[PDB]
Design an enzyme around this catalytic site. Structure first.
Site, short mmCIF file in Angstrom:
data_model
loop_
_atom_site.label_atom_id
_atom_site.label_comp_id
_atom_site.label_asym_id
_atom_site.label_seq_id
_atom_site.Cartn_x
_atom_site.Cartn_y
_atom_site.Cartn_z
N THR A 1 1.09 -1.62 -0.03
CA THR A 1 0.53 0.08 0.32
C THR A 1 0.79 1.47 0.18
OG1 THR A 1 -0.15 -0.02 2.53
CG2 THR A 1 -1.32 -1.29 1.54
N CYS A 2 1.91 1.42 -0.21
CA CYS A 2 2.86 2.46 -1.04
C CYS A 2 3.17 2.55 -2.92
CB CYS A 2 3.78 2.93 -0.25
SG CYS A 2 3.61 2.36 1.69
N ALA A 3 2.56 1.17 -3.41
CA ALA A 3 3.51 1.01 -4.88
C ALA A 3 3.00 2.39 -5.67
CB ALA A 3 2.45 -0.12 -4.67
N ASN A 4 3.43 2.79 -6.57
CA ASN A 4 5.19 2.29 -6.76
C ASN A 4 5.62 1.61 -6.66
OD1 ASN A 4 5.16 5.42 -6.69
ND2 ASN A 4 4.95 5.05 -4.29
#
Lengths: 1234, 74, 76, 74
Positions: free
Chosen positions: A1206-1209
């Site tokens: 949940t930081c993607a990228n």
């Protein structure tokens, strides 16, 4: 607790000294001491422990023969002392005092238990950051890298950091020590791939050259294999630019300090691909394309790739500008191969010629000129036959810059004079060696008139201003290797590594104002001494006379076919082309322009006739015009005399001033004000310095008695005055400037106001006006934009942009402002975008750099951008965003969208807000667009508005377009990724409407219908059939269609027309009414509020620099990159591995097979916005990765799904097995995601 | 009595439940059986996504109806 | 084909295999030919620590691919 | 797996990491979930400090392993 714990501390230190008589209790003593020191602070630690006795005991343990085989104790001792001087920096030298460094080498000599060695290497490396020479002093540091291939990763890279840190403080007496380690670092550098390992092995090699270039036997250090890998380390794209420059720094020193391997760099290694592949990394199309690629190459690499190629060659016959001496470089009698040695030059010249052409920096031009007259002296008559063309036009472009030299005072600037002298010397050499080969081309391109004019100019320049007014023509070759060591720089907290001493090579000689003229007069006299020596020019004159004759027919298209038929055969000969000089010499450009700008024929017929004849030589015609404009270009690029170069350090500038109101505060006050901000912000600076009548003091800034408004910058009008004065700009930084002057923040209103009263700067282009006129005519024909970009104008504009002071000065050259808006086709899209941000987004969004430290530390205080969270609800996403404009429409804050009663924030909700809202602007229920109309609600086709109903109410459709304008303007100012679907025609109606003194709808009608079928082909063919048979009244009445709007038959074209039918009586009125309705008066009411709302954020007038077909792409038409090769180059991988991995090959093989909808579904889930950012995956920050995903608990990964933290990228890919299950899983994810 | 839960590939797990049991009680018991944590567990029936706040009889799920289980992602 | 194994003391041993077999298979073979238990063995090739479950073919191993063997206390 | 990192004031965070996530990756993760910069954070587990070069598999850290974070006093 300290006193109670001391009886256990000191006891454990005593046990360390008792390790000789107690080999095992010291184990837990060291463990207990090392554990605690890591979890506490130094200031408590410093007051308790006797560090010297600690390290003495540790040395006693590490050196005792009794405890040699206590491998489970030596690890603990090494770890304990490592943590000892990790927390206390000054204890590092304390260990050095008792020969700890030699002791720790002994362990690494022979090991059978690696867990000790990976601690010893990890520890002694931390010593090398401070005492790099103390490790180097022992001088057997090849031990550390003998066990390279047994260390996992961290020890593997910390066994190189220590050597590099000890390889950076080298002096002259350590020549043999480096020979000791070189055979053991040569192959592991030859076979490394990690970046924190290749960024240390280049710092070490740079430090070697920084010190040992004077030491003898330096030729045998850098052998063939090592210099070969340095050469091929540039030919790979993954190497960063910062290491790329360093590698060239080593490589040029290895050709300057010696000659043996300097011969190798030209005989054995290839230098052409060396130069080519470094440039092409910045290219955009794989079918390049040398000319356009060099525009995007950074100036820093251009400097190095030229100052290396000049060093690789031996000096010239007459050293006007080069300052080299080296002995072993007079051996140019060695011509054995005219291929192995000369295929380098005959294709290198077409490289650095372009480097000169597409670059405008003073250093780059100087280096490249030196290289030209250095290498051309080496070629002979046989070798010179294939290099004739480019050099002639290059030197013609060099010494045609005469007009820039003259000042507003009439004085001279030595910068242009050096370039003129260098070009004249190159001309002298080429005319002296290849007169028979160079007589025709020089005469054809017209250089003899130029050198005559330059001779006159040199004669006209004053001389008597000499302070040393005793000058002879022979003041020759003063200091020319007294000038490679004079400024070599390099003669407490712990850094990452010891930076090697920055070497500064100097090959330039500064020329004096008298010496440039003394050389120039003799050079022009010489070239005129050698100056002594077709009817096609008379045919050009005949064509000029024919065009100037009004007796020639110019009305029907049959006339204009013959108008260009003669021109094509006049210009383009079967052998060569008319040069850029001959085209503008006889006034042929004027003859074309007079016929183009006077004939009453519509633009459509002119374009049709041009395209019917110039079918296949459009670029052949573009190149001649581009060369003509480059030579005729006369605009002087401005400069402000920066002392910090083109960087943020030039943003950190301040100037002492004595402001004078045109008590003593308004007449004499020395304060160092920054040279960045505006006169609005100058009022702000004086408000700050007042700490209130000074707040109210809005000034008419009469600097040198000039009524200039509030819009300029702190030194803006000052710099404009020092341009009209054109004084010595260097004194401006030393002058206490006598500044002469007389007398909504809620959003707040941005300071983009630098160009409210500057956009109408109609600067004369001189004799180039005809050239620009027919270039604008050619781009109005809708032809491709292959060669419309002018190389040297684009280079000049780029050189203007990377001068931060002038760009932030609001005093941008008015020729640039005129040329960008009026002729936006001469510059690349990236350059125009950079121009847009700087001229449009305000100082807050300009001085905050993104132009890649403490240089902006004092500037970020006054030039930062502010965040602004915006809270909305998902079910009310559209309506709330409407009031969002009414409240926070024209703010300078970067938009941040938040959803109420939700925690997940970031760029996710920001991207999800306007992406959904844009689709809500594609709803048929809003009655905003042409919904065909001949199921759902969303429009899936091309998008364009519908005419109003004059009788019906329209208070909402216009308001919605007014809101859409502020949305779309807000999108570009924040670089947001939007998916909206506009039509090319919709922005044609917006560029034309906002351009002053031009009709929005073209007066031409068959142009209008051709522009219509891009909206609705049915009505287009209906209308062109109406036009086709407007005389057959039987067929005209067959339609029996009254004056009602087609498709929406409720709107009358003319009053009473709902009864009158279609005939030949008023067919023209019917056509001009339906056109006026569907494209014009019926739709202009949306546009007048769209621009009204668009200009709330920032004016649409700036947007005219772009193109409609290059606005649909930025607004969500651009096709994305999905090819096989272009994607894994944007992968970074790591952790398994990427190899093979048989899960990556197929994962990239599936992503290529996506349709247009699977791509959108996968992107809106991986990123948040349904479309890809600008320019490919490169603009994704950071890059999207592939990470291993293990199997938990026991079930196979061929059932699970690709995880994200949940930081993607980025992504984490489980171990799938079969291709079909991969296809099922990835699809099920992307469709189930939405 | 028991209900059918289909895995994402071929295999099927059957669990003994009651109408009063909840959509999170079933997640807990399938974590007891298989071991996959609930945060990576997605329950799907009749196409629509089963929110885990209801009960089994709240959605009126049939005795031997096969609600589909998806090991979801983040 | 065959591969070579390097210990920390530099002595050389020779194998006899095909482009096949697993990491546990080869560590058991090294145990057989040297008496070193598998928990006392660590394998490094191409500057990385190997995985027990993976095979030699997935690591791109060819004939006479000189790999290395490492002894750790574990040792944290 | 899921681990615990406890600060000096007892406030313990939870992670969702894997032995295939280096050490610096979890440093970046804690950089995202709190605002202490990476160099001002020292990871301590089983006495020895967690170096930023290895992975979680080399230091033998498993699920539910509550380690401590030391705020570097630069």
């Amino acid at each position: 607790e300290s006193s109670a714990r001391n009886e256990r501390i000191s006891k454990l230190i005593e046990n360390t000294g008792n390790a000789s008589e107690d080999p095992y209790i010291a184990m837990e003593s060291l463990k207990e001491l090392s554990e605690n020191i890591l979890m506490m602070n130094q200031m408590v630690v410093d007051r308790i422990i006797p560090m010297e006795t600690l390290i003495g005991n540790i040395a006693a343990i590490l050196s005792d023969k009794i405890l040699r085989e206590e491998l489970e104790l030596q690890m603990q001792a090494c770890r304990c002392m490592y943590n000892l001087f990790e927390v206390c920096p000054e204890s590092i030298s304390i260990a050095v005092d008792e020969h700890v460094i030699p002791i720790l080498q002994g362990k690494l000599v022979e090991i059978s238990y690696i867990d000790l060695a990976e601690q010893v290497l990890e520890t002694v490396e931390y010593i090398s950051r401070v005492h790099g020479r103390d490790i180097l002093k022992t001088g057997q540091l090849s031990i550390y890298v003998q066990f390279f291939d047994f260390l996992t990763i961290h020890a593997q890279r910390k066994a190189i950091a220590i050597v590099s840190n000890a390889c950076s403080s080298i002096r002259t007496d350590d020549f043999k020590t480096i020979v000791e380690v070189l055979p053991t670092l040569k192959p592991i550098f030859s076979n490394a791939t990690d970046q924190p390992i290749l960024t240390r092995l280049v710092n070490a090699m740079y430090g070697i050259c920084g010190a040992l270039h004077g030491v003898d036997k330096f030729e045998t250090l850098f052998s063939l294999d090592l210099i070969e890998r340095i050469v091929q380390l540039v030919s790979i794209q993954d190497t960063p630019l910062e290491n790329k420059l360093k590698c060239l720094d080593i490589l040029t020193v290895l050709a300057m300090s010696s000659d043996v391997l300097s011969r190798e760099l030209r005989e054995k290694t290839d230098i052409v691909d060396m130069a080519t592949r470094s440039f092409q990394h910045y290219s955009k199309s794989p079918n390049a394309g040398l000319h356009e690629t060099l525009i995007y190459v950074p100036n820093s690499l251009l400097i190095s790739i030229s100052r290396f190629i000049v060093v690789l060659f031996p000096p010239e016959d007459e050293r006007i500008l080069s300052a080299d001496k080296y002995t072993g470089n007079s051996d140019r009698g060695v011509i054995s191969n005219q291929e192995k040695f000369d295929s380098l030059v005959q294709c290198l010249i077409p490289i650095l010629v372009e480097i000169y052409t597409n670059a405008a920096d003073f250093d780059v031009r100087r280096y490249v000129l030196i290289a030209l007259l250095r290498v051309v002296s080496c070629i002979n008559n046989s070798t010179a036959k294939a290099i004739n063309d480019q050099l002639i036009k290059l030197i013609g472009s060099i010494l045609a810059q005469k007009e820039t030299a003259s000042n507003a005072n009439g004085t001279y600037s030595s910068e242009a004079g050096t370039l003129l002298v260098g070009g004249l010397s190159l001309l002298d050499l080429i005319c002296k060696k290849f007169s028979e080969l160079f007589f025709p081309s020089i005469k054809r391109e017209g250089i003899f008139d130029l050198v005559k004019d330059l001779s006159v100019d040199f004669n006209n320049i004053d001389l008597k201003e000499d302070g040393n007014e005793n000058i002879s023509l022979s003041d020759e070759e003063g200091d020319l290797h007294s000038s490679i060591e004079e400024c070599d720089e390099g003669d407490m907290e712990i850094p990452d590594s010891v930076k090697p001493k920055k070497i500064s090579i100097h090959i330039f000689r500064t020329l004096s104002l008298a010496y440039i003229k003394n050389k120039g007069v003799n050079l022009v006299n010489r070239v005129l001494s050698q100056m002594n020596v077709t009817e096609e020019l008379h045919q050009i004159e005949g064509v000029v006379s024919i065009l100037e004759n009004p007796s020639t027919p110019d009305k029907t298209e049959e006339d204009w076919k013959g108008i260009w038929s003669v021109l094509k055969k006049c210009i383009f000969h079967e052998d060569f082309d008319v040069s850029g000089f001959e085209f503008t010499s006889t006034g042929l450009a004027s003859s074309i322009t007079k016929r183009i700008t006077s004939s009453t024929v519509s633009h459509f017929i002119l374009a049709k006739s041009f395209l019917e004849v110039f079918e296949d030589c459009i670029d052949r015609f573009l190149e001649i015009l581009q060369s003509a404009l480059t030579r005729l270009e006369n605009f002087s690029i401005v400069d402000c005399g920066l002392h910090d170069g083109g960087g943020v350090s030039s943003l950190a500038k301040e100037i002492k001033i004595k402001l004078v109101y045109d008590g003593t505060d308004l007449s004499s006050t020395i304060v160092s004000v920054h040279c960045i901000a505006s006169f609005t912000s100058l009022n702000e600076f004086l408000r700050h310095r007042m700490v209130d009548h000074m707040r109210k003091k809005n000034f008419d800034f009469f600097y040198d008695n000039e009524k200039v408004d509030m819009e300029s910058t702190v030194f803006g009008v000052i710099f404009n005055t020092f341009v009209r004065r054109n004084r010595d700009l260097k004194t401006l930084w030393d002058d206490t400037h006598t500044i002469k002057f007389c007398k909504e923040a809620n959003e707040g209103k941005k300071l983009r106001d630098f160009y409210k009263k500057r956009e109408f700067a109609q600067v004369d282009t001189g004799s180039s006006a005809d050239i620009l006129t027919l270039l604008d005519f050619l781009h109005s024909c809708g032809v491709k934009s292959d060669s419309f970009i002018n190389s040297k104008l684009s280079a000049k504009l780029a050189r203007q942009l990377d001068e931060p002071l002038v760009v932030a000065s609001g005093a941008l050259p008015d020729w640039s402002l005129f040329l960008t808006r009026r002729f936006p086709f001469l510059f690349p899209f990236d350059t125009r975008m950079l121009f847009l941000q700087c001229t449009s987004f305000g100082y807050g969004r300009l001085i905050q750099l993104w132009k890649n430290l403490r240089n902006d530390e004092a500037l970020q205080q006054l030039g930062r951008i502010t965040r602004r969270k915006l809270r909305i609800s998902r079910k009310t996403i559209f309506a709330t965003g409407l009031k969002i404009l009414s409240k926070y429409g024209s703010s300078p804050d970067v938009l941040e969208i938040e959803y109420q009663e939700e925690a997940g924030t970031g760029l996710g909700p920001t991207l999800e807000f306007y992406s959904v809202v844009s689709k809500y602007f594609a709803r048929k229920s809003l009655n905003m667009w042409r919904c065909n109309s001949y199921t759902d609600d969303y429009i899936t086709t091309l998008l364009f508005p519908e005419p109003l109903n004059p009788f019906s109410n329209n208070e909402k459709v216009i308001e919605l377009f007014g809101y859409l304008g502020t949305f779309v303007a807000r999108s570009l100012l924040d670089n947001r990724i939007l998916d909206f679907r506009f039509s090319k025609v919709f922005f044609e109606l917006l560029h034309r409407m906002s351009t002053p003194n031009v009709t929005t709808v073209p007066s031409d009608v068959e142009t209008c219908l051709l522009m219509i079928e891009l909206v609705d082909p049915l009505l287009a063919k209906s209308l062109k059939y109406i036009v086709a048979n407007k005389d057959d009244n039987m067929t005209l009445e067959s339609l029996s269609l009254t004056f009602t709007v087609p498709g929406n038959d409720d709107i009358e074209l003319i009053p009473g027309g709902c009864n009158k039918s279609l005939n030949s009586s008023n067919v023209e009125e019917y056509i001009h009414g339906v056109i006026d309705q569907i494209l014009g008066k019926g739709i202009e009411k949306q546009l007048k509020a769209f621009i009204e709302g668009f200009s709330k954020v920032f004016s649409y007038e700036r947007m005219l620099i772009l193109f409609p077909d290059e606005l649909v792409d930025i607004f969500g038409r651009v096709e994305e990159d999905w090819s096989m090769a272009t994607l894994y180059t944007n992968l970074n991988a790591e952790h398994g591995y990427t190899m093979d991995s048989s899960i990556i090959h197929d994962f990239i093989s599936i992503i290529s097979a996506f349709g247009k909808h699977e791509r959108r579904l996968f992107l809106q889930f991986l990123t948040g916005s349904p479309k890809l950012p600008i320019g490919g995956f490169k603009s994704l920050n950071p890059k999207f990765t592939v990470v291993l995903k293990h199997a938990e608990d026991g079930l196979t990964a061929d059932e699970y799904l690709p995880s994200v933290m949940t930081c993607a990228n980025y992504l984490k890919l489980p171990k799938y097995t079969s291709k079909d299950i991969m296809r099922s899983r990835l699809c099920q994810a992307i469709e189930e995601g939405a | 009595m028991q209900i059918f839960v289909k895995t994402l590939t071929g295999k099927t797990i059957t669990l003994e439940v009651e109408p009063s049991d909840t959509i999170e009680n079933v997640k807990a018991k399938i974590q007891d059986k298989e071991g996959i944590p609930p945060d990576q567990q997605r329950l799907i029936f009749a196409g629509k996504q089963l929110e885990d706040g209801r009960t089994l009889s709240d959605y009126n799920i049939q005795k031997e109806s096969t609600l589909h289980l998806v090991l979801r992602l983040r």
